[PDB]
Amino acid sequence: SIPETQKGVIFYESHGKLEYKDIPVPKPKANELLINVKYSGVCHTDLHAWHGDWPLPTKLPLVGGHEGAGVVVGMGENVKGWKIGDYAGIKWLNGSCMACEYCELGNESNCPHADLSGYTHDGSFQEYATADAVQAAHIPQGTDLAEVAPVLCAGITVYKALKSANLMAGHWVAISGAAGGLGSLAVQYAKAMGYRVLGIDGGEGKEELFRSIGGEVFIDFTKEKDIVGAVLKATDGGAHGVINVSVSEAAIEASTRYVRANGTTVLVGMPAGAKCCSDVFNQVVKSISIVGSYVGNRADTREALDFFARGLVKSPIKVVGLSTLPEIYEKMEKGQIVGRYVVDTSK
Amino acid sequence: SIPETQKGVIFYESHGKLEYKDIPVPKPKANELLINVKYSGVCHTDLHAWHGDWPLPTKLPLVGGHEGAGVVVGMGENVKGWKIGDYAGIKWLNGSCMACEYCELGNESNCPHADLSGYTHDGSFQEYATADAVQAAHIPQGTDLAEVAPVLCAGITVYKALKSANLMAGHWVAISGAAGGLGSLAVQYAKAMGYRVLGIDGGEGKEELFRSIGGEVFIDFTKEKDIVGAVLKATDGGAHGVINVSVSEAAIEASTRYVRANGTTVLVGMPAGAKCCSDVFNQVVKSISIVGSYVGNRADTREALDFFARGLVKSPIKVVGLSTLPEIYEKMEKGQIVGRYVVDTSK
Amino acid sequence: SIPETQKGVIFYESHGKLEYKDIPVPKPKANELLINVKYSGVCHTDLHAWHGDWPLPTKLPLVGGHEGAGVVVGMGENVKGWKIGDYAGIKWLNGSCMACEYCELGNESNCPHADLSGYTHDGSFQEYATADAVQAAHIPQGTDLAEVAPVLCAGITVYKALKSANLMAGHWVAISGAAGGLGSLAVQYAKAMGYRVLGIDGGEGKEELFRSIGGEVFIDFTKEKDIVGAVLKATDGGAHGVINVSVSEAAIEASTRYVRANGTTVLVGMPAGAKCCSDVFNQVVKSISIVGSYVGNRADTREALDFFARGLVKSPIKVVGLSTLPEIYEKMEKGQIVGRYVVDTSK
Amino acid sequence: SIPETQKGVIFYESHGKLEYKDIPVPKPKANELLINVKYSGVCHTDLHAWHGDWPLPTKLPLVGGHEGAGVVVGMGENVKGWKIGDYAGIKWLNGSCMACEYCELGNESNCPHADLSGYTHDGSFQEYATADAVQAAHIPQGTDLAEVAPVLCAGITVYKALKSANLMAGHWVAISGAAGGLGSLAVQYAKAMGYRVLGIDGGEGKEELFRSIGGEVFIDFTKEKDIVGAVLKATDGGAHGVINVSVSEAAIEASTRYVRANGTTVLVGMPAGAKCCSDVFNQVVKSISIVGSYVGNRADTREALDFFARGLVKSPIKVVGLSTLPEIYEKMEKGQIVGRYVVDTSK
C-alpha cells in the first residue's frame, strides 16, 4: 500500500527554491514509525529552518514542516503502544537520545542529540514522513486532523508556557500578543486552565476575535500609549504572569514592568536576535522571574491534546493544498499569515 | 533603665554629614518593640539609603543601618511570643502591613506599605531602636551577636536566593562573586544545603578564602578569559543554578550563558542601574529562568538563623565602634570594605 | 452606636442548654477588631465545639459559630489595612500568635496558640463579635453577606483541599460526597479551577443537584456496589485526586483504592474517630499520597473569596433567625441540615 | 566472546528449589542490551518474587535478582548513548512501555506494562542478563561495582523517598529503621542532602553503626517506650519528614504521630499486608501527608549514583559467591541478612 514514492516539497540549498516533487518513502527505523501525514501547520520556525539563519545546521536536503498530523501506516518492529491506523502527530522535537540528563528529567527538547523534525529530520511537508515512536503525539481517534494540526506545536508551546508561568487558578495572565496565531491558543488554554486572561494586542479585528475566543480585558497596544499603567490598572497590581508570544522586542521589554511582584514572565516568542533588558533593580526588588519556554515535552503534549479533545481550544485554520507551499512561504516571509495556514498533503 | 537619650549617628540631609550625637529613645508602638542594639552590620544598601538615589524617598531625619542585632529591653503591650531580655534582630524589612496580598502570600518585602528599616524607619545605628514585633528576627539565646549581625541581611538574602534557585542537593551552583561579603555567606549556605559550590571571583587572596570556607571549584574572573567555557567545563554542562551576587553588570550578562539548560539564574546584586540583557533566543531554547530575589521573609529568616546556630556558616566580621561610622561610610563609598564592617553600638 | 449589650446565643456548660440572651459587647483589643456580625453559617465543627468532645478544651462561657460575616464597626488602634464599614469575615481560625514556626511558614492553623473562634474565642453567634485583624477575611464590598457566610469555612476548606490535592487543570478529581454541604462547594471550586469533577454521593435529589452545580460524572454510592471499579472505569485509571468530604469512614477507606497511581487523597471530613487504614503495599506500589487539610490560611481565604466574587461558586443557603439557634442545633445533631443553615443575627 | 551458555541460579516453580545450572545467553532485543553482570545485591523484593505471593504473576522460569551491576558486552542495534565496555546497572524496573501516561510523566514504575526485572524478566542472578537500554543505570566508569550494587535498588529507593518527603535543607527527618539495610543508605543520603537525621532503630550494635555513618539523634525503639514523645522532644515539634523503612506495621502507625504538622510520612517498607491506620482527625488537623514511594525513576537513578560517585554514601556489603545463592535465600527468609548480602556472579 505504501507507495514507493510520495509527493512533497523539498529544498536542497538553504533559502533556495521549494521544489514540489516526488521522493522515496522514508523507511521506519526499528525505533521510528512512518506516518501518512494528512495535514500540517506552518509557523515562523519553518521560515527560520528554510533560511538556515539559526545556529544549528539544517540537514540538507530537507523537507520542512514540524506541525504535522496523520495516520500511522507502518511502525517499527521495536515500537510498542502504537497500532496501525492510529492518529499520530509529528511535533517539532522529533526524537531525543533518551540517555542524557535532560532527556531523563523530562525536558527532552534540550538533549544535545535532539533530532529536530523539519530541521535535522525529514519534516511534515510530505505525504509520508517518519517520526520517533516515543515523541510522536497520540492524537485521539476521530479527531479532525486538520483542526488539530496547529495544536501540535503552537498549542503545546503555549500550554507549556502557561504551566511554566507558575499561576494558580484565578490569577491574572497577560498574553502579550493575544490575537496572534500563538496568542489565540494561549488565551483559550488560559481560560480553560482557570486563569483570567488579559490580552495585549492590536490591529484590525484583533479585539473582536479576542472577545470571541473569550478574554476578560483587552489592551490595544496601538491606541493605548502607556501599556504598563493600563495593565497595572486592569489587573490591579500587575498580571500574575505574562506570556510574551509577541514578536516586538519592545513589547518583551515592556512586559517585565507590568508583571505583578513575585510574578513571572514567560518568554516564548523568539524574535530576530532580541534582548530582554529588564531593569535589574526593578526585577530584584519585585522578584520578577523571566522564564523561557521551548516546545513542551510528552506530558505537555498529552495534556494539550486532551484540552483539545474536550473542545475547549479551537484554531481558526485555513486548509491549503501542499502544491502551493512555495507560495505559502513567499507570502509568509512577507507577513501574510492571517489565521494559521494549515497545509493539506493530499492536495 | 531605658535612658531618655541614646547615642547614635543620624543625618538630616541626603548625602549630607553623619552627625554622631544623642537622640531621644524611640518609644515602642503597641505593635513594635524596642531593642538595645548591641551590634550592626553595614552593606551597600546603607550607602544607597544615605545617598537617597534610590527611587523611594528616605524618611529624614534618618538613622541608618538595616542589619542590627541586640537585646529586647521593652516590648509593646500588644506583642506576644517575645520576652524581655531576648535576642532580636532588626532586618532590612522592618514592618509590613500584614493586610495586602503579598504580605499574606509570605513575600512581605513587597507590601506597598513596607516600612523599610534604615530607609523609612529609624535604622540600627543607635544604642536603642524600635522594630516590628513580627518581622524582627528571633536570634537564639547565647549567640554571639557581633558574629550574627551580617547574617541578618546578607545571610538571609543569599539563603532566600539559593532557595529561589530551585536546586536539588547535589546540583551545581555557581556563586558569581563568591569571595565577596555576600558571596562567602552564599558559598557556606550552599555547601550546608548540599549543593556543589563553584565560585567565580578574583583579586587578592580571594581563592584562598574561598578554599577556606569550602568550595569545590574556583574560577578566577581575571586570569581566565572565557569564563563561560570554563564554567561549562567544570560543571560539565553549566551550573544548575547561578547566584549573581557580583556587582559587574558584565558578570550578570555572562551568567545567563554558563547556566545549564532548565537551570536558574538568581539575580541578587543590584548594581547601579544595570540591565540583564540575555539573548532571548538562547534563553528560550535552553529554558533559562532569571529569577530575582529580595530580602527573605520570616521563614527564611528563621531557617538562616538556624543554619547559623548550628555553626555551619561563619562571617569574618571586623568589630568597629559606632563613633567612627562616618569614616566607615567614607571608606565604604571608596570601596574599603574588606571582610564585613560590623559596627559596635556601645563603642 | 455600639450598644452596651447585644443579643446572642451562649452556653456555659458543655453540651448544655443554648441560652439566647444579652451579653456585653466584646471590646476590641489593640490587635483585634469588632464586627457587627450580620450572618453566620453553621457546620459540624460547631456541634463538636458545643459537645466539648474534641480534645482541646472549649473556653466556657462560649458563644459559638465560626463562619460569621458582618461589617466592621470599630477597629483596634493598632489595626492597619482595615477601614470602618468594611465587610469582614470571622473564619474558624480566629487569631494565631504570628511568632511560632507554622505561623511563619503560612500554615497558621497549627500555631500552638491558635485562638480558635467559637472554640476558644467568642464565636460568631452574636450581634457583635471580636476577631483578629490579620486572620479576618476581607469580604469585598457589596457582596451578599448571607450568601458568602458558608464560603468562609466550607468554601475555604475545600479550596485549600483542592490546592493540596496537587492537581493540574484537566485532571480527574473525585469529590467523595459531592452532594453534601462541603461537596457542593468542592465541586464548584473544582470546576472553576479547571479540573474534571467526578462526584460520589447518593440519596434523594443528590445527583440532580450535582448535575445542576455542574459535574461531569456522578456515582451513586447506594445503587452502585463496586464503587472502586466504577470510578476506575469512569476516570479511566483512577481519579487524579480524591477529596474525602464524606463522613463514612468506609468511604475514606474505599477512597485510597480508586485514586490513580501517583495521585492524591485529601482527607477533609473528620468523622467521629475514624481510621484511614489503606493497604500499605497498594499505597506504596502506586505511590498514593494521603494528605490532610485543615482550614485554609489567609492566602487561601483571599483566593476563595475571589472565586466567590466572580460568581463562580454558589451556596444554597437557608436564612434562619438567630433566636431559633438552639432548635437549629437540635435538628443538627439529629441530621436535619438540608442545604446549609445560615443564621441571621438581627432576627 | 559471549559464551553460548552462562552460569546462573534459576527456579521453575514458585517457592521451589533454586537450581544453579547453565542457561543460554539472553539475546539483546533491538531495544535491550546485554550485561555481563559482575555483582548483584539481594533484598526482600527477591524473597517476595521467589515466593510468588505478590499479586503480579512471576514469569516462570525465572532467574531472580533486581539489583545487578555489570559491564555491557553487547548492545542492541537500536541503542544509542551506550558504548561497549560501559558499566550498567539492572535496577528493579527493567523496562517500561514509554507510551502510556505514567511513563511520560516520569513515574515509569507504574506503567501497566512495566517489565519488572527478576519478577517478569530475567533477573540479575546470572553471568549475563539483558536489560532495557533506557532504564538501565549509567554506572560511572571506574566505580567499584560490588560496592555500587546495593545503591541500585536500595539507595535509589531511599533517595526517591527523601525527595518525596518534601523536605528543605535543615529540616528534621526521622528514618524509622535507620540501622537496617535501607535505613543506613537513607541516613547517608539524608545527611548528604542537608537534612538533620534522627534515626529510630534498635537491637545490637545498631546505634553504633548509626553514629558511624553519621546521625544526629538516635532513638532505641526497644529501650525507649514512648517513641512518639521521644521524637517530639528531640526534634522539638515532630520530624519534618518521616521515612518508614522499617517492617513493623506498629512502627508505621506510630510514625503518623511524631511527624510535625504539615510534615510528611513517606511509606517505603512494604511489610506483609499491613495497614497504615492513622487517626483521620489527627491527620487532618495537623495536615499530615502520608506519601508512598516505589523505586525511583531514571532521574533519581542518575542523582543517586551521582551521590555515590562523590563518596558520600557507602554500603557495608558482604561479597558472596553466586553458587551459594540458595543458601543465601534460606538464611534470608529466616532473617540472617546482617549488612547486605551482595552476590558475586563469577564465584
Ligand SMILES: NC(=O)c1ccc[n+]([C@@H]2O[C@H](COP(=O)([O-])OP(=O)(O)OC[C@H]3O[C@@H](n4cnc5c(N)ncnc54)[C@H](O)[C@@H]3O)[C@@H](O)[C@H]2O)c1
Ligand atoms: N518557543 C516555541 O516553541 C515557539 C513555537 C512557535 C512559535 N514561536 C514564536 O511565536 C511567534 C509567532 O507567533 P504568531 O504566530 O502569533 O505570530 P504573528 O506574527 O502571526 O502574530 C504576532 C502577534 O503579535 C502582536 N503584536 C505585534 N506587536 C506587538 C506589540 N508591540 N505588543 C503586543 N503584541 C504585539 C501582533 O498584533 C500579533 O497579534 C514567533 O516569535 C515565533 O518564533 C515560538
Ligand SMILES: NC(=O)c1ccc[n+]([C@@H]2O[C@H](COP(=O)([O-])OP(=O)(O)OC[C@H]3O[C@@H](n4cnc5c(N)ncnc54)[C@H](O)[C@@H]3O)[C@@H](O)[C@H]2O)c1
Ligand atoms: N538583594 C538584596 O537583598 C541585597 C542585600 C545586600 C546586598 N545586596 C547586593 O550585594 C552586592 C554587594 O555584595 P558584597 O558585599 O559581596 O560586595 P563587595 O563589593 O564587597 O564584593 C563583590 C564581589 O564581586 C566580585 N566581582 C567583581 N567583579 C566581578 C566579576 N566581573 N565577576 C565575578 N565576580 C566579580 C568581587 O571580586 C567581590 O568578591 C551589591 O550588589 C548589593 O546591592 C543585595
Ligand SMILES: NC(=O)c1ccc[n+]([C@@H]2O[C@H](COP(=O)([O-])OP(=O)(O)OC[C@H]3O[C@@H](n4cnc5c(N)ncnc54)[C@H](O)[C@@H]3O)[C@@H](O)[C@H]2O)c1
Ligand atoms: N477540615 C475542615 O476544616 C472542615 C470544616 C468543616 C467541615 N468539615 C467536615 O465536613 C463534613 C461535613 O460535610 P457536609 O456538611 O457536606 O456534611 P453532610 O452530612 O451535610 O453531607 C455529607 C455528604 O456525604 C455523603 N455520603 C454519606 N455517606 C457516603 C459514602 N459512603 N460515600 C460517599 N459519600 C457519602 C452524603 O450523602 C452527603 O452528601 C464533616 O466531616 C466535617 O467535620 C471539615
Ligand SMILES: NC(=O)c1ccc[n+]([C@@H]2O[C@H](COP(=O)([O-])OP(=O)(O)OC[C@H]3O[C@@H](n4cnc5c(N)ncnc54)[C@H](O)[C@@H]3O)[C@@H](O)[C@H]2O)c1
Ligand atoms: N519500596 C521499595 O522500592 C523497596 C525496595 C526494597 C526494599 N523495600 C522494603 O525495605 C524493607 C527492608 O529494609 P531492610 O533491608 O533495612 O530490612 P531489615 O530487616 O534488614 O532491617 C529492618 C530494620 O527495621 C528495624 N526495625 C524493626 N522493628 C522496628 C520498629 N518497630 N521500629 C523501628 N525500626 C524497626 C530493624 O531493627 C532494622 O534496622 C522491606 O519492607 C522491603 O519491602 C522497599
Ligand SMILES: [Zn+2]
Ligand atoms: Zn538525550
Ligand SMILES: [Zn+2]
Ligand atoms: Zn510550530
Ligand SMILES: [Zn+2]
Ligand atoms: Zn501589606
Ligand SMILES: [Zn+2]
Ligand atoms: Zn544588609
Ligand SMILES: [Zn+2]
Ligand atoms: Zn504562632
Ligand SMILES: [Zn+2]
Ligand atoms: Zn465551618
Ligand SMILES: [Zn+2]
Ligand atoms: Zn508505559
Ligand SMILES: [Zn+2]
Ligand atoms: Zn532491591
